[PDB]
């Protein structure tokens, strides 16, 4: 009948420990789309587009083969528009919106967590 493919999307980020003098960048981050289970999304995903902030060169980043990740460095938080394109042209692209998290919440800072993780769950239906 119907096919449901769970996914996780979001980002991870880590503070440099000091501001980089060359560009004022403070964090390294990775935005991603991953299958929840250990499997090959390229079977049904054509490409995943990650629209970054205007301060980034070539802000419309396209990933055609797994892993569907973009690693960059920066200093501020912004919204990333993630658009998932399917192999089947009859399947409308999936649009996700994700706020890039760089700064650790006081709760997680107190829990001694080193890296920021902002991950969300979704299910793609076919
Ligand atoms: C090449 C490296 N540049 C960057 O890393 C970068 C990141 C963010 C930037 C930026 C450059 N230049 C501006 C104006 N911003 C802003 C983008 C909107 N956000 C606002 C926000 O997205 C925050 C989280 C809560 C919701 C609103 C506030 C930000 C200072």
How far is Cα 58 from Cα 47, in angstroms, rounded to an integer? 16
CA dihedral 32, 123, 48, 55 (to 10 degrees): -50
For residue 46, the 8-state DSSP code is: E
- Report the SS3 class of residue 40: coil
Q: Give burial (CB, 10 Å; 0-12/13-18/19+) of 108.
A: middle
CA distances from 60 to 22, 57, 81, 82 (A): 24, 9, 9, 10
- Partner residues linked to 45 by β-bridges: 86
- Tokens 């079977």 appear where? 43
How far is Cα 74 from Cα 102, in angstroms, rounded to an integer? 9
Q: Are 8 and 119 in contact (CB under 8 A)?
A: yes
Read off the tokens for 9: 């999307």
Read off the tokens for 59: 């802000």
Q: Are 34 and 121 in contact (CB under 8 A)?
A: no
Q: How close is the Cα of 100 to the center of ligand 1, in Å?
A: 9
Technique used: X-ray
Q: Which of 53, 70, 75 maximizes ligand 1 atoms within 8 Å of its Cβ, making it the mutation to test the pocket?
A: 53
DSSP track, 54-119: TTSSS-EEEE-SSSEEEEEEESS--EEEEEEEESSTTSPPEEEEEE---SPPHHHHHTT--SEEEE
Which residues lie closer than 8 Å to 56 by C-beta, 6 or more apart?
Answer: 72, 74
The angstrom resolution of this structure is 2.6
- Tokens 């996914």 appear where? 7
The torsion region of residue 58 among left (phi > 0), alpha (psi -120 to 50) and beta comes to: left
Read off the tokens for 46: 């054509």
Q: How close is the Cα of 55 to the center of ligand 1, in Å?
A: 9
How far is Cα 13 from Cα 22, in angstroms, rounded to an integer? 20
Q: Are 28 and 13 in contact (CB under 8 A)?
A: yes
Alpha-carbon dihedral sign for residues 81, 73, 78, 33: positive
């Amino acid at each position: 009948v119907t096919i449901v493919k769970p996914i996780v999307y979001g980002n991870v980020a880590r503070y440099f420990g000091k501001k980089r003098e060359e560009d004022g960048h403070t964090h390294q981050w990775t935005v991603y789309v991953k299958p929840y289970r250990n499997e090959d999304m390229s079977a049904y995903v054509k490409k995943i587009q990650f629209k970054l902030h205007e301060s980034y060169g070539n802000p419309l980043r396209v990933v055609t083969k797994p892993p569907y990740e973009i690693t960059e460095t920066g200093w501020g938080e912004f919204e990333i528009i993630i658009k998932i394109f399917f192999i089947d042209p009859n399947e409308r692209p999936v649009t996700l919106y994700h706020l890039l998290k760089l700064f650790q919440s006081d709760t997680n800072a107190m829990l001694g967590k080193k890296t920021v993780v902002s991950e969300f769950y979704d299910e793609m239906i076919f």
